[PDB]
Amino acid sequence: GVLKIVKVYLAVKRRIQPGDKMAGRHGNKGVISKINPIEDMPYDENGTPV
Amino acid sequence: FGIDMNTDYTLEEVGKQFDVTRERIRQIEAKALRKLRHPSRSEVLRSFLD
Amino acid sequence: EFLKPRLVDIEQVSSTHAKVTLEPLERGFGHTLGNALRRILLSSMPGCAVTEVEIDGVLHEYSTKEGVQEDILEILLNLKGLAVRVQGKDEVILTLNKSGIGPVTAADITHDGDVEIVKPQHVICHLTDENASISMRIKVQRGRGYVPASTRIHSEEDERPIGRLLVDACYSPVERIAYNVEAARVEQRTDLDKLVIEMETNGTIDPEEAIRRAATILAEQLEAFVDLRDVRQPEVKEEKPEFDPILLRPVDDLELTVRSANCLKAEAIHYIGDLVQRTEVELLKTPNLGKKSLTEIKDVLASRGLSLGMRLENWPPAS
Amino acid sequence: TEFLKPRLVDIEQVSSTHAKVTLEPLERGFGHTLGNALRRILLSSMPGCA
Amino acid sequence: GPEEITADIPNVGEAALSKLDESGIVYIGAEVTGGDILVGKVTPKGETQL
């Protein structure tokens, strides 16, 4: 029943946004909740944010 | 057109029903379409086309 | 009854890194201006960084140039960090050319009177086959903060250049900021304080230039803060369009032939609210329209439902 | 380059001594920077007689 | 009848047929988003009876 077929391959580049499940190797799951500005991040006396 | 009527009528059928017949009715149509063709009027019906 | 600070020694220690000091500070303003400056230094600073890039024989980020050992996706991600500084211009398209088994550094670009490659060793890619050769049109703009690649297609309207690979835009030259107020007693004063703002640039802002344009914003923001006029907006826009909106789209949408496409540029007709009102009379006397040339225009106006040459005693209203 | 300065600001005051002001739309992070920096000056370094 | 992969698609503008070649297949390298046509296709359905 089929004459000819076209397969298109897409390369989507997905960044990361609230909702994605992430976890360390020790069974600590977690779903990124807000993506914060570098301005608001905890920093140390050397200024380097976390 | 079949607009709120059963069947649609040959343009001659329409002419006898008005006693002024023939080429006469064939122009009223085109001008009516022509009337609904440009704006104020055109705007609303246009949007139905996809 | 107050004081005011100023900036004494700005002490570079590298192109990238310097401690600028602000001496006349009252009790506690140290941490007050100190935190509120880091906030405006880490974000709102102006910066230029590469926006689009076209490369010789490559069609998308995900391919492989012959005789190079990076992939287009990697070369783009190398350009994101190419640190340039330009002056009078706002968007400048640099050109890159080099052949032969050899690291293509940042120095291998071509110079423009405004282009200063603040780090010319910066690796872009490596060639690897004697007569392998690349060429690219790198385009740098200058904006504020972080405009990621994706959001840079909604303005579309023919960005078609398949070659142009867009890179995420990191328009900023702050890397990391850190203040510490150590107490500083000018010989006589009860207790004033210092403010060492240690900072880490990419090389393309001289500390003083920055910290000035930082304080500037704070003013314009605080400008509206001084008095509070309860201000609001007019609103209630207009709900009466006369004509059919179709007469507000450009003549491109008509999908016509090239000899007829430039010809409505010529005789001054962009929106089709003017093509709508120009009769066949008007058309033989227009540059380059004939028997074959004008049959084309009466057919794409038919399909959309308009005609050639009519009126509308009110074009175009009204703002 | 050029910046964003707010619009729509409604001071709804309860009693003459107390008042509640809302003021949008600030750039990203500009609520906290203006907010905190103004809190410090209102609280710590404000001329008065007690 | 048979389905054709032709680029002749009823009631679509050139805005669509830009990312499509003469044959009806999307070009390699075209950055597309939701809604853009990857492969033009048409199925035989005659006499609609509108």
Q: Kindly state whether residue C129 falls inside one of the protein's structural domains.
A: yes
Q: Kindly state whether residue C250 falls inside one of the protein's structural domains.
A: no
Q: Kindly state whether residue C248 falls inside one of the protein's structural domains.
A: no
Q: Kindly state whether residue C233 falls inside one of the protein's structural domains.
A: no
State chain D's maximal CA–CA distance in angstroms.
Answer: 45
Q: Are residues C185 and C283 in the same domain?
A: no
Q: Are residues C121 and C261 in the same domain?
A: no
Which DSSP letter does residue A49 get?
Answer: B
Q: Are C84 and C173 in contact (CB under 8 A)?
A: no
Q: Are residues C77 and C150 in the same domain?
A: yes
Q: Are residues C134 and C271 in the same domain?
A: no
Residue carrying the six token digits 């029903």: B17
Give the integer Cα–Cα distance in Å for C174 and C38. Answer: 10
Enumerate the residues of chain C whose CB falls inside 8 A of the CB of residue A39.
38-39, 42-43
CB distance from D37 to chain C under 8 Å? Answer: yes
CB contact under 8 A, C39 and A39: yes
Give the number of A-C residue pairs with CB atoms closer than 8 Å: 27
CB distance from E11 to chain C under 8 Å? Answer: no
Give the integer Cα–Cα distance in Å for D13 and C216. Answer: 31
What b-and-e string marks burial along A16-42, b requiring 16 or more CB atoms within 10 Å of the CB?
Answer: eeeeeeeeeeeeeeeeeeeeeebbeee
Residue C6 makes CB contacts below 8 A (sequence gap 6+) with C22, C23, C24
Experimental technique used? Answer: X-ray
Give the integer Cα–Cα distance in Å for C263 and D44. Answer: 70
For C125, the domain range is: 47-171
Give whole-number Cα distances, B18 to B12, B21, B25, B33, in Å. Answer: 10, 7, 9, 19
Give the integer Cα–Cα distance in Å for C202 and C15. Answer: 8
CATH number of the domain to which C129 belongs? 2.170.120.12
Q: Are residues C75 and C148 in the same domain?
A: yes
Q: In terms of DSSP bridges, do strands C133-147 and C103-105 run parallel, antiparallel, or are they unpaired?
A: unpaired
Which DSSP letter does residue C136 get?
Answer: E
Give the integer Cα–Cα distance in Å for A2 and C17. Answer: 66
Q: Which of C162, C169, C119, C160 is nearest to C139 (CA)?
A: C169
Residue D11 distance to chain C (closest CA, Å): 6
Q: Kindly state whether residue C292 falls inside one of the protein's structural domains.
A: yes
CB distance from E27 to chain C under 8 Å? Answer: yes
Number of domains chain C is built from = 3
CB contact under 8 A, B42 and C244: yes
Q: Are residues C73 and C157 in the same domain?
A: yes
Q: Where are the alpha helices (DSSP H) in chain C?
A: 29-42, 72-79, 207-226, 258-266, 272-275, 281-284, 291-295, 297-304
Enumerate the residues of chain E whose CB falls inside 8 A of the CB of residue C255.
13-14
Q: Are residues C139 and C183 in the same domain?
A: no
Q: Are residues C64 and C204 in the same domain?
A: no
Q: Which of C201, C65, C70 is nearest to C123 (CA)?
A: C70
Q: Are residues C76 and C137 in the same domain?
A: yes
Euclidean distance between the first and the last CA atom of chain C, given in angstroms as a whole number: 50
At A37, list the tokens. Answer: 């500005």
CB distance from A42 to chain D under 8 Å? Answer: no
CB distance from E28 to chain C under 8 Å? Answer: yes
Residue C77 makes CB contacts below 8 A (sequence gap 6+) with C167
Give the integer Cα–Cα distance in Å for C181 and C192. Answer: 10
Q: Which of C168, C136, C170 is nearest to C49 (CA)?
A: C170
CB distance from A37 to chain D under 8 Å? Answer: yes
Give the integer Cα–Cα distance in Å for E36 and E16. Answer: 7
Q: Which of E37, E25, E33, E15 is nearest to C158 (CA)?
A: E15
The per-residue DSSP string of C260-311 comes to: HHHHHHHTT--BHHHHTT--SHHHHSSTT--HHHHHTHHHHHHHHT--SS--
Q: Are C236 and C254 in contact (CB under 8 A)?
A: no
Q: Which of A10, E38, E29 is nearest to C165 (CA)?
A: E29
The per-residue DSSP string of C120-132 comes to: TT-EEEEB-STT-
Identify the structural domains of chain B with CATH numbers, from first to last.
1-50 (1.10.10.10)
Q: Are residues C139 and C40 in the same domain?
A: no
Neighbours of chain A (3+ CB pairs under 8 A): C, D, E
Residue D34 makes CB contacts below 8 A (sequence gap 6+) with C36, C221, C222, C225, D26
Integer-rounded Cα radius of gyration of chain D: 14
CB distance from E31 to chain A under 8 Å? Answer: no
Q: Are residues C29 and C90 in the same domain?
A: no
* Closest chain C residue by Cα to residue B33: C305
